[PDB]
């Protein structure tokens, strides 16, 4: 196909970001390659405008407050009326002229899927104020687009974009599922989803040979925060398989490293403990367990497992008043923005506490009065919580 | 055909039961004088010597006795007493200068019934042959020492007696009685051939052999053997050449259970003596002359042979075992003759009588004349 | 007034005669003494002053005055007085003229005087030969108060020795002071030549028709220098008639003189007490009467000894003398009391008809012994005649004595014995086995028509079988280490009983019974439910000994036995080690062990039931250099036992045996070749927990399951780079070098690594990679074929810890 | 003590089913009766160089199957008249008391006088009215010639005589005092009676013994019919046997049943006074039978005593010719035999026919025949004949 020889390269150059270069061949075909069937120029202009549309898409700065719907949907008659059946003299012989019809239908499906994904991103942005991002609803909503659009464009000419699209879909799902699974303490499911996302990313990503569009950078940012979020939660089940001075070299390699902060803090200020509690949300144990094993149901004071407790084991003689305080003022901390304070006499401990996440809650303890007005500690807890909640992580989706 | 009444007799006390083959006579102390050896089931053997009613000596062996004998089994030029029990025990006694313990013991297979001591092959060493109730015959030899098994013959009918006789060729043989009045030749031990002779074929049969025929021929000579049946028939034949010539046979009306050889006349020939359960003893020579003797008593065991009873002298003797715990020994069974004759037909053989009658002028033709002459010569010397 | 004349020869005999006279008048007259006679007459007499007949012809006289009233017969009174005087004179003459006469260095002289007084040696005095006898016979015509007489005849005279002892014993019994002498006449002389004889000489006169005499004199020897004193203590009728004063005494000495002329006794008792003397005479007459009544040997023994039973029988009344019949000759004869103890006690006509064996106690004693021998024969004959009809027709526990009589009346026909092989010493519980054997044989014997013989109160058993010909008896007993049976016969045309004994002898079958019993016991012990034999019994040695003893398969047995030896290759492991392993895991191979007995060996047993019209119980037993160690030599036995029958078959290699042994050989070979691997696998598995070829050798035969087949969540691990596996291996090697058994290749183009936990010995977990092809894997290894799930707990912990580092490896690849 | 061995050997022995009596024996043939009715005849048959004893049963006509034989006897008639006479006294069992009967057999037909077969059925039946004791025969000199008469002792103490009639040829009873004046006035029953004639002399001797032991001997002349002399003694026990014999001066032997058998010696000149006793002849129960015959082949008689104790004693008369006054010749025990059954009767006849007289002993079980020692007899005959030849040659 001499006519499609140019089109093959023009479309295949879009696998990597080559929108500016892709435009140039269209300009050449517009007038230099004149006297042709009146569908080639139409599809050339359509693809040229598609290049700018996708550039705006990848920019992910064109949709913060809308536009990003009109320009998006500004090619439906274009794509559909690109083909016009047959008629008077056009371009080549009536042998491969009607090859663009399948591509046009696939591109109509492309446009529809892109618009729905854009509405998806806008919905996420709008929801990204709240007080906690329920990942289960987002997962329940995203599967619809993937299911409906799956296998809706194929004429062995559009594999790259599809793959890219697939990546742009597939990657996200895992992280959100991870974002889901981690919120509910799923060790292996979250880990597998995250690793599959990492593996799938590299090929369509790191193989670039310009600065990746903000969409890519936010994906990287989200994964990178998820790594540290993942690392903190399971640290007490990961310290076992290595050496105390060995895991430092890795835990210092997470961009928002949490482990170092508390260890430094205990040295900086004579303390008693620091712990992270996870109520069972209405539960095998530490690590991976059998496909179906005997799990004795939670009973007694066991819905409050100290998942992580930094210096030594959790004080037995100092955990009767942590599930007294936990429910004794169990209203304010559910607003996820305040920190509790109790100073007593015969325990001499000040139990600061904040709720970064609905299920999880951090706590410290001292050996004397702490003077709640002392902002030294409160700032640390605020700073710590500012990252776990993923408020900035969800918010920063458009520069 | 004529009856006799022996009077002289010795009674020996003996309490206990025994088999018919558990009594014998022979020299045990090596003094050329025979002594009686009797073994009972109770595990004791008594020897009787001379005329003492009490036994000379009692020797005890472990088990129940089934066979006794006296002979040269060790082949060291001496006579020894052999005792064989039912469990296949074997005891040797040297009663030659207070039970006498044996000086040897050896275990053989059990179910022993009959014993025999003779040189069967002819190597110069005497062999021991033992019969069994399960129709088995087993020969042995003394090896300097113990007993070495030789051969083991199998038979169909029950065995009742073992005998050795001079074969047609001139070598010793081995005869075994067989029911139905039959006998088997056993090939010597270095397979078994049968011969028949007319009634119920399950009748017990006893055999005897090695019958003497002349004086001084006991060193090496045989050829005649006798068969007896429980239904009451006797027979003498000769085992010469190919066919066994039939010498004689008699039919009686008693239950015959014994067969021995004796010498009552003293002319060298041996007479066959048989006994019945009721005690009707028969003595028959080789010339069809029967002599009857009725003891009028039920008899357990019988034994005819040489014995030293009075003043150290071997004489023919008959021995019966009675149910009254007694053993009867007749010692003067010697007979001047065996047929019946007179003076007239005994003087008609020597030629001197005829010569004297011719010299006297009286012709030995008128019986009354010679009868009167003999009467005058005997009862009227002057 | 009357007077009587007296001879002058008694001129000085006045003191004696008067002494006699006072006695003589004392009898007829009851008290110059006054006497009263009852006509009634009073008599007063006074003596005054003045060849047998001359000396007593009736010179002092006697004057008497009698006052008679009524018919007193004065002439008769005078005659009586004269007779009394004459009798007194005769008595005095006899007393003083004959009684004092003797009957017949210093020590020797006194010895003859004693020998003459008692007179056993010497000669008789002339007085006691002719004079005395005639005198005492003559003073019997003249009425005197001291006289006796008796007479007898007897049918023979050999009774004399049989009367001479009885009479002296009798006289001694009635008179202590008496002695008897037996002076016999010398049979050449006569005029007082009486030669004393010794007590024991029987009859020293073989000559018949000889009129032997006897002089049986009896006198109290202590009556001399003694008639003055009281004598005999009232035994003598008289005493000194007058008075013993004035130094004069009458010879009141008594006497006794018996005499015989051929055959005629005659007593002459003098001075015996009247009643006692009359009783003495009566006793002698009765003694002779009894001796003569003891003449029936002559009648019905001596006569019948020569076939004369019809000529001289019993109670035939021999001789009809009408003197005083014969008290002992009555129809009621005490025959047994007259041939023994000759005395007058205080069919017989055919006695000796056809029986073969002091003459009185010599001729009938053999008759008594003959009559007793018949009773002894008769009792014995009834004792062996009631039993025959009792046992034959009727269908009582005969005692020991009856059994002994039956055995001594029977003949021994046949016997047989068998060997008891359970006892090692004959190569508490053995007694029980012997009792069971005996009981089973008793059952077999009663099943063929025999009746057990009970024994009433006073382990041998007796069984009988009554037949018209006679009684056949058996005896079962244990004698040492052998079981023996004896057969007795007792005949009661005459050859059918012999046939009956022969046929029963042919049905004995002891050897076949022992064969069946031994094989049945072997089978029962093989199951082990019937623990008859003692524990630790060497069954293989017992089987070998039994086969050696019966290597021919006794004729009418029903059970069968076979022995064979199996040699197996066993090339990999040692033969003895394989045998030990199979014995240890015998339960896994449908086999059972046996602890035969301080060395202990183990034998393998098995059994099943095969009914191929056979219905046979099948028993199988198996027991045990470098080439020898590579050869599994094991000898095995096959035992077949019947179910229904237990007794030897009455009528007359083995297909069942060969059929069983074929598949037995096949199954043994299959089991060996299958169990070799089951041992090889499990041997070095244990060694693993301490080689690469050894490591691969297991994986050929182990049940291993992939991680993708236990939990699908692990499926992600199946599709990642080998470098991740290398990282994993390094982490585990650093973490559990104790549990990590790393294996390499001498090309380093394949590695095997495993990790166990000691306690969970059931399964370890291995990784695998080739690094050339990239064929990396991951599996979990299970030695056994783990059966099922629903429709292992300690297994997932390996799947926990091992997977618990798989994620740690993943985490490091993301930080 | 026996002064030598017995030279008699037993030749034959025939067993009797039933026992016999002392009178069973009779008379080269022998007759033996059985109490149960059986009668047997013993003889010998010659065959070349051997003999065979023969005992044959005989059948007698008028003895029923239920009769019991008491006594038998036989004899030959006088030389003037041939014939063999047999007499059997038995008792019919019909009735409480048995009925005695007498049968006399004699074949008067010519050609069968000695034929026992024809004699066996010639019975003449006679009533008795008394119990028979013994049947014997005697020889009397009547008129000019000698006649043999029968004698039978009965239950009544009297001997009954039966004479053959010269007319109708029967056997009729006759008074006993006509020919035997000495056989009258008896008391007991005669058990054995013997009559010994004197050859070439008209005188004879008679002896008898009764059950009471009364033994009577009498010398009687035949032609004069007068009792020449008379003796009697009273012994003890039944008299089993009395025999008149001359030792070397006639003598009588009495075998009492409870006293030793003795001889009396010199009857004619000493009567019955100086007896000689056989020493120790009463140690074997009762002497049943007796015999006086030569047994030592010396020409002088010997006494044979058979006892119930199965003894066959032989006493040899030592001769007074030997001159030993201190122990003057009497009788001494020569030899002694023994049997197994009591001996009842004895006989001395040449049964075989060799001149050597046999000894036939009838005992409770049967008849034994005893012959002399064949070797002893042969040598003695040879040496005697040689001595008689040398004496003839040298002295003549």
Curated annotation (Swiss-Prot), chain A:
SUPFAM superfamilies to which the protein is assigned, alphabetical: FLJ32549 C-terminal domain-like, FLJ32549 domain-like
GO CC annotation, single: lysosome
Main localization, broad class: membrane
Keywords: Disease variant, Intellectual disability, Lysosome, Membrane
Keyword Zinc found: no
UniProt keyword Signal present: no
Source superkingdom: Eukaryota
Signal sequence interval, chain numbering: none
Compartment annotation: Lysosome membrane
Entry-linked Pfam families: C12orf66_like
Disulfide bonds: none
InterPro entries: C12orf66-like_central_sf, KICS_2
Example GO BP: cellular response to glucose starvation
Family: Belongs to the KICS2 family.
Described purpose of this protein according to its UniProt entry: As part of the KICSTOR complex functions in the amino acid-sensing branch of the TORC1 signaling pathway. Recruits, in an amino acid-independent manner, the GATOR1 complex to the lysosomal membranes and allows its interaction with GATOR2 and the RAG GTPases. Functions upstream of the RAG GTPases and is required to negatively regulate mTORC1 signaling in absence of amino acids. In absence of the KICSTOR complex mTORC1 is constitutively localized to the lysosome and activated. The KICSTOR complex is also probably involved in the regulation of mTORC1 by glucose.
Associated pathology: Intellectual developmental disorder, autosomal recessive 83: An autosomal recessive disorder characterized by developmental delay, mild to moderate intellectual disability, and poor or absent speech. Additional variable features include seizures, hearing impairment, hypotonia, and non-specific facial dysmorphism.
Protein name per Swiss-Prot or TrEMBL: KICSTOR subunit 2
Species name: Homo sapiens (Human)
Lineage, broadest ranks: Eukaryota, Metazoa, Chordata, Craniata, Vertebrata
Gene that this sequence comes from: KICS2
Swiss-Prot record, chain B:
Per-repeat ranges for FG-GAP: 19-48, 111-140
Subcellular location: Lysosome membrane
Family matches, as InterPro entries: Integrin_alpha_N (IPR028994), KICSTOR_ITFG2 (IPR031793), WD40_repeat_dom_sf (IPR036322)
Pfam families: Itfg2
Location (main, coarse): membrane
GO biological process: cellular response to amino acid starvation; cellular response to glucose starvation; germinal center B cell differentiation; negative regulation of TORC1 signaling; regulation of TOR signaling
Keyword 4Fe-4S applies: no
Disulfide bonds: none
UniProt keyword list: Lysosome, Membrane, Phosphoprotein, Repeat
Keyword Phosphoprotein part of the UniProt annotation: yes
One Gene Ontology CC term in the entry: cytosol
Function, as annotated: As part of the KICSTOR complex functions in the amino acid-sensing branch of the TORC1 signaling pathway. Recruits, in an amino acid-independent manner, the GATOR1 complex to the lysosomal membranes and allows its interaction with GATOR2 and the RAG GTPases. Functions upstream of the RAG GTPases and is required to negatively regulate mTORC1 signaling in absence of amino acids. In absence of the KICSTOR complex mTORC1 is constitutively localized to the lysosome and activated. The KICSTOR complex is also probably involved in the regulation of mTORC1 by glucose.
Descriptive protein name: KICSTOR complex protein ITFG2
Protein source organism: Homo sapiens (Human)
Curated annotation (Swiss-Prot), chain C:
Cellular localization per UniProt: Lysosome membrane; Peroxisome
Coiled coil: none
Tissue spec. comment: Expressed in the brain, predominantly in the parietal and frontal cortex, as well as in dorsal root ganglia. Expressed in peripheral white blood cells.
Superkingdom field: Eukaryota
Oligomer and partners: Part of the KICSTOR complex composed of KPTN, ITFG2, KICS2 and SZT2. SZT2 probably serves as a link between the other three proteins in the KICSTOR complex and mediates the direct interaction with the GATOR1 complex.
Function according to Swiss-Prot or TrEMBL: As part of the KICSTOR complex functions in the amino acid-sensing branch of the TORC1 signaling pathway. Recruits, in an amino acid-independent manner, the GATOR1 complex to the lysosomal membranes and allows its interaction with GATOR2 and the RAG GTPases. Functions upstream of the RAG GTPases and is required to negatively regulate mTORC1 signaling in absence of amino acids. In absence of the KICSTOR complex mTORC1 is constitutively localized to the lysosome and activated. The KICSTOR complex is also probably involved in the regulation of mTORC1 by glucose.
Protein name, per record: KICSTOR complex protein SZT2
Native source organism of the sequence: Homo sapiens
From Swiss-Prot, chain D:
Keywords carried by this UniProt record: Acetylation, Actin-binding, Cell projection, Disease variant, Intellectual disability, Lysosome, Membrane
Subunit-level organization: Part of the KICSTOR complex composed of KPTN, ITFG2, KICS2 and SZT2. SZT2 probably serves as a link between the other three proteins in the KICSTOR complex and mediates the direct interaction with the GATOR1 complex. May associate with F-actin filaments.
Associated disorder: Intellectual developmental disorder, autosomal recessive 41: A disorder characterized by significantly below average general intellectual functioning associated with impairments in adaptive behavior and manifested during the developmental period. MRT41 most consistent features are global developmental delay, macrocephaly with frontal bossing, high levels of anxiety, and some features suggestive of a pervasive developmental disorder. Less common features include fifth finger clinodactyly, recurrent pneumonia, and hepatosplenomegaly.
Cellular compartment(s): Lysosome membrane; Cell projection, Lamellipodium; Cell projection, Stereocilium
GO biological process, one term: cellular response to glucose starvation
Gene Ontology CC: one annotated term: lysosomal membrane
InterPro entries: Integrin_alpha_N (IPR028994), Kptn (IPR029982)
Coiled coil: none
Entry GO MF terms: actin filament binding
Domain of life where this protein originates: Eukaryota
Identification of the protein by name: KICSTOR complex protein kaptin
UniProt key word Membrane: yes
Main localization, broad class: membrane
């Amino acid at each position: 196909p001499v006519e499609q020889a140019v089109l093959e390269t023009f479309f295949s150059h879009l696998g990597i970001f080559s929108y500016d270069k892709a435009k140039d061949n269209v300009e050449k075909e517009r007038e230099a390659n004149k006297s042709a069937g009146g569908s080639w120029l139409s599809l050339l202009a359509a693809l040229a405008h598609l290049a700018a549309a996708e550039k705006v898409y990848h920019s992910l700065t064109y949709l913060g407050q809308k536009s990003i719907r009109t320009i998006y949907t500004s090619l439906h008659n274009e794509l559909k009326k690109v083909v016009t059946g047959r008629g008077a003299l056009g371009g080549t012989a009536p042998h491969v002229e009607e090859l663009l019809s399948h591509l046009s239908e696939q591109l109509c499906f492309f446009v529809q899927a892109r618009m729905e994904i854009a509405d998806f991103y806008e919905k996420m942005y709008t929801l990204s104020t709240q007080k906690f991002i329920n990942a289960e609803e987002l997962v329940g909503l995203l599967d619809a687009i993937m299911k409906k659009y799956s296998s809706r464009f194929h004429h062995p000419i559009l594999s790259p974009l599809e793959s890219s699209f697939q990546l742009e879909v597939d990657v996200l799902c895992h992280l959100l599922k991870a974002q889901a699974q981690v919120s509910e303490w799923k060790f292996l499911p979250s880990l597998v989803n995250l690793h599959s996302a990492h593996t799938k990313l590299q090929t369509w990503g790191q193989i670039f040979e310009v600065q990746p569009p903000h969409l890519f950078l936010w994906l990287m940012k989200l994964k990178n925060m998820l790594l540290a979020k993942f690392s903190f939660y399971f640290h007490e089940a990961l310290s076992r398989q290595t050496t105390a001075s060995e895991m430092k070299t890795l835990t210092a390699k997470a961009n928002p490293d949490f482990f170092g902060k508390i260890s430094s803090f205990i040295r900086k200020y004579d303390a008693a403990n620091v712990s992270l509690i996870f109520d069972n949300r209405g539960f095998q144990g530490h690590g991976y367990h059998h496909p179906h094993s005997y799990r004795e149901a939670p009973k007694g004071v066991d819905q409050y497992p100290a998942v992580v407790s930094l210096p030594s084991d959790r004080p037995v003689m100092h955990w009767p008043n942590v599930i007294m305080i936990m429910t004794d003022r169990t209203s304010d901390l559910n607003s996820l923005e305040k920190v509790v304070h109790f100073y007593d006499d015969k325990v001499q401990s000040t139990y600061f506490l904040t709720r970064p996440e609905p299920h999880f809650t951090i706590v410290i303890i001292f050996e004397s009065k702490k003077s709640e007005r002392d902002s030294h500690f409160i700032s640390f807890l605020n700073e710590v919580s500012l990252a776990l909640k993923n408020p900035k992580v969800f918010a920063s989706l458009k520069p | 055909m004529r009856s006799v009444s022996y009077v002289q007799r010795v009674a020996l006390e003996f309490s206990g039961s025994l088999f018919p083959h558990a009594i014998c006579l022979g020299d045990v102390d090596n003094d050329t004088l025979n002594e009686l050896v009797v073994g009972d089931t109770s595990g004791k053997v008594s020897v009787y010597k001379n005329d003492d009613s009490r036994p000379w000596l009692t020797c005890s062996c472990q088990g129940m006795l089934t066979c006794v004998g006296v002979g040269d089994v060790c082949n060291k030029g001496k006579n020894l007493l052999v005792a064989v029990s039912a469990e296949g025990w074997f005891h040797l006694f040297d009663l030659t200068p207070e039970e006498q313990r044996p000086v040897f013991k050896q275990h053989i297979p059990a179910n022993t019934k009959v014993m025999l001591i003779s040189d069967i092959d002819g190597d110069g060493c005497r062999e021991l042959v033992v019969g069994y109730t399960d129709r088995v015959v087993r020969a042995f030899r003394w090896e300097e020492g113990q007993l070495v098994s030789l051969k083991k013959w199998m038979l169909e009918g029950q065995v009742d007696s073992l005998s050795v006789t001079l074969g047609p060729l001139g070598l010793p043989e081995l005869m075994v009685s067989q029911p139905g009045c039959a006998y088997a030749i056993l090939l010597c031990t270095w397979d078994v051939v049968l011969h028949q002779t007319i009634h119920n074929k399950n009748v017990s049969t006893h055999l005897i052999g090695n019958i003497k025929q002349g004086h001084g021929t006991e060193s090496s000579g045989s050829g005649l053997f006798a068969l007896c049946t429980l239904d009451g028939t006797l027979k003498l034949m000769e085992e010469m050449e190919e066919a066994d010539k039939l010498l004689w046979s008699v039919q009686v009306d008693h239950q015959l259970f014994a067969l021995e050889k004796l010498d009552v006349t003293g002319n060298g020939h041996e007479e066959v003596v048989a006994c019945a359960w009721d005690g009707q003893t028969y003595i028959i020579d080789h010339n069809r002359t029967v002599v009857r003797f009725q003891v009028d008593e039920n008899i357990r065991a019988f034994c005819a042979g040489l014995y030293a009873c009075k003043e150290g002298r071997n004489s023919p003797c008959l021995v019966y075992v009675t149910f009254n715990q007694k053993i009867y020994v007749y010692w003067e069974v010697q007979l001047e003759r065996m047929e019946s004759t007179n003076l007239v037909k005994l003087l008609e053989t020597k030629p001197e009588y005829h010569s004297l009658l011719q010299e006297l002028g009286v012709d030995p033709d008128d019986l009354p004349v010679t009868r009167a002459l003999l009467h005058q010569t005997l009862y009227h010397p002057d | 007034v009357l007077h009587l004349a007296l001879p002058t020869s008694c001129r000085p005999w006045l003191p004696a005669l008067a002494w006699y006279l006072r006695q003589n008048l004392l009898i007829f007259l009851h008290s110059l003494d006054i006497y009263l006679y009852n006509g009634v007459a009073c008599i007063t007499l006074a003596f005054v002053d003045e060849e047998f007949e001359q000396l007593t012809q009736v010179a002092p006289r006697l004057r008497l005055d009698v006052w008679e009233k009524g018919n007193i017969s004065i002439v008769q009174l005078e005659e009586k007085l004269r007779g009394a005087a004459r009798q007194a004179l005769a008595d005095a003459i006899i007393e003083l003229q004959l009684l004092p006469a003797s009957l017949c260095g210093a020590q020797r002289q006194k010895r003859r005087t004693t020998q003459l007084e008692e007179g056993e040696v010497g000669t008789l005095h002339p007085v006691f030969a002719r004079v005395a006898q005639r005198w005492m016979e003559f003073m019997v015509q003249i009425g005197c108060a001291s006289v006796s007489r008796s007479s007898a005849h007897m049918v023979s005279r050999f009774l004399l020795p049989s009367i001479l002892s009885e009479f002296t014993a009798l006289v001694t019994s009635m008179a202590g002071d008496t002695s008897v002498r037996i002076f016999e006449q010398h049979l050449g002389s006569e005029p007082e030549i009486f030669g004393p004889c010794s007590p024991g000489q029987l009859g020293p006169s073989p000559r018949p028709a000889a009129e032997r005499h006897l002089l049986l004199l009896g006198r109290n020897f202590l009556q001399w220098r003694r008639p003055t004193q009281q004598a005999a203590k009232a035994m003598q009728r008289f005493e000194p008639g007058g008075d013993g004063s004035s130094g004069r005494n009458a010879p009141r000495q008594r006497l006794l003189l018996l005499e015989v002329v051929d055959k005629k006794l005659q007593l002459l008792t003098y001075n015996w007490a009247p009643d006692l003397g009359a009783a003495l005479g009566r006793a002698l007459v009765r003694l002779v009467q009894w001796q003569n009544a003891r003449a029936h040997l002559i009648f019905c023994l001596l006569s019948q000894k020569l076939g004369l039973f019809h000529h001289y029988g019993q109670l035939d009344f021999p001789v009809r003398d009408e003197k005083e019949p014969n008290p002992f000759l009555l129809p009621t004869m005490e025959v047994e009391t007259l041939i023994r103890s000759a005395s007058p006690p205080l069919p017989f006509d055919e006695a000796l008809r056809d029986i073969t064996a002091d003459p009185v106690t010599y001729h009938g004693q053999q008759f008594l012994e003959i009559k007793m021998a018949e009773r002894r024969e008769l009792e014995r004959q009834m004792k062996m005649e009631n039993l025959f009809v009792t046992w034959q027709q009727r269908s009582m526990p005969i005692s020991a004595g009856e059994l002994e009589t039956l055995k001594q009346s029977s003949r021994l026909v046949h016997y047989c014995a068998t060997a008891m092989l359970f006892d090692p010493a004959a190569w508490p519980w053995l007694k029980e086995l012997s009792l069971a054997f005996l009981q089973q044989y008793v059952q077999y014997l009663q099943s063929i028509g025999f009746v057990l013989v009970p024994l009433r109160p006073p382990t041998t058993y007796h069984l009988q079988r009554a037949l018209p010909g006679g009684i056949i008896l058996m005896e079962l007993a244990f004698q040492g280490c052998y079981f023996c049976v004896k057969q007795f016969a007792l005949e009661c045309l005459s050859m059918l009983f012999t046939e009956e004994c022969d046929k029963v002898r042919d049905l004995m079958h002891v050897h076949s019974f022992s064969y069946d019993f031994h094989l049945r016991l072997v089978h029962q012990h093989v199951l082990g439910a019937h623990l008859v034999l003692r524990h630790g019994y060497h069954l293989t040695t017992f089987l070998r000994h039994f086969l050696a003893h019966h290597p021919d398969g006794p004729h009418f047995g029903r059970n069968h036995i076979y022995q064979g030896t199996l040699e197996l290759p066993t090339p990999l492991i040692a033969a003895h080690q394989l045998y030990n392993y199979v014995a240890d895991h015998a339960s896994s191979y449908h086999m059972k062990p046996l602890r035969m007995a301080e060395h202990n060996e183990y034998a393998l047993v098995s059994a099943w039931h095969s009914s191929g019209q056979d219905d046979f119980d099948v028993s199988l037993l198996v027991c045990h250099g470098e080439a020898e160690r590579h050869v599994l030599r094991l000898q095995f036995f096959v035992v077949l036992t019947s179910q229904r029958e237990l007794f030897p078959r009455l009528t007359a290699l083995f297909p069942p045996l060969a059929a069983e042994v074929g598949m037995a050989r096949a199954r043994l070979a299959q089991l060996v070749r299958l169990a070799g691997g089951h041992c090889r696998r499990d041997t070095l598995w244990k060694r693993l927990f301490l080689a690469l070829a050894e490591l691969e050798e297991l994986l050929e035969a182990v049940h291993a399951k992939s991680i993708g087949d236990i939990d699908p969540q692990l499926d992600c691990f199946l599709s990642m780079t080998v470098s991740w596996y290398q990282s994993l291996i390094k982490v585990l090697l650093s973490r559990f070098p104790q549990s990590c058994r790393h294996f390499q290749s001498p090309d380093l183009g394949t590695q095997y690594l495993v990790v166990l936990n000691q306690k969970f010995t059931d399964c370890f977990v291995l990784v695998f990679l080739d690094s050339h092809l990239g064929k990396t894997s991951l599996t979990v290894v299970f030695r056994e074929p783990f059966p099922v799930q629903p429709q292992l707990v300690s297994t997932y912990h390996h799947l926990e810890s091992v997977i618990n580092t798989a994620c740690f490896t993943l985490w490091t690849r993301l930080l | 003590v026996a002064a030598g061995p017995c030279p008699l050997r037993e030749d034959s022995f025939t067993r009797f089913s039933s026992q016999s009596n002392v009178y069973g024996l009779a008379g080269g043939e022998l007759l033996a009766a059985t109490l149960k009715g059986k009668v047997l005849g013993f003889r010998y048959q010659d065959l070349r160089q051997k003999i065979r004893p023969v005992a044959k049963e005989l059948q007698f006509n008028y003895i029923p199957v239920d009769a019991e034989i008491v006594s038998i006897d036989t004899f030959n008639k006088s030389p003037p008249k041939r014939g063999l006479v047999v007499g059997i006294t038995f008792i019919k069992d019909s009735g409480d008391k048995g009925s005695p009967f007498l049968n006399i057999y004699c074949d008067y037909e010519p050609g069968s006088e000695y034929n026992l077969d024809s004699i066996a059925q010639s019975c003449l039946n006679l009533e008795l009215q008394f119990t028979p004791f013994q049947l014997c025969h005697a020889e009397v000199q009547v008129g000019d010639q000698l006649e043999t008469v029968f004698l039978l002792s009965g239950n009544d103490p009297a001997i009954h005589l039966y004479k053959e009639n010269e007319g109708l040829h029967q056997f009729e009873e006759q008074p006993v005092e006509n020919l035997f004046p000495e056989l009258t006035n008896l008391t007991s029953s005669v058990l054995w009676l013997d009559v010994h004639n004197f050859p070439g002399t008209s005188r004879r001797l008679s002896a008898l013994g009764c059950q009471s032991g009364y033994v009577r001997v009498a010398h009687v002349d035949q032609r004069s019919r007068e009792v020449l002399q008379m003796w009697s003694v009273l012994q003890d026990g039944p008299i089993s046997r009395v025999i008149v014999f001359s030792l070397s001066e006639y003598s009588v032997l009495v075998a009492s049943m409870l006293e030793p058998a003795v001889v009396y010696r010199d009857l004619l000149n000493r009567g019955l006074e100086d007896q000689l006793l056989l020493p120790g002849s009463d140690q074997f129960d009762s002497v049943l039978c007796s015999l006086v015959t030569d047994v030592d082949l010396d020409g002088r008689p010997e006494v044979l005593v058979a006892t119930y104790g199965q003894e066959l004693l032989c006493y040899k008369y030592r001769g007074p010719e030997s001159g030993l006054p201190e122990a003057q010749h009497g009788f001494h025990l020569l030899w002694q035999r023994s049997f197994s059954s009591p001996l009842l009767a004895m006989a001395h006849v040449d049964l075989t026919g060799d001149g050597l007289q046999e000894l036939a002993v009838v005992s409770l079980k049967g008849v034994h025949i005893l012959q002399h020692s064949l070797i002893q007899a042969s040598e003695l005959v040879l040496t005697r004949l040689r001595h008689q030849v040398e004496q003839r040659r040298r002295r003549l």
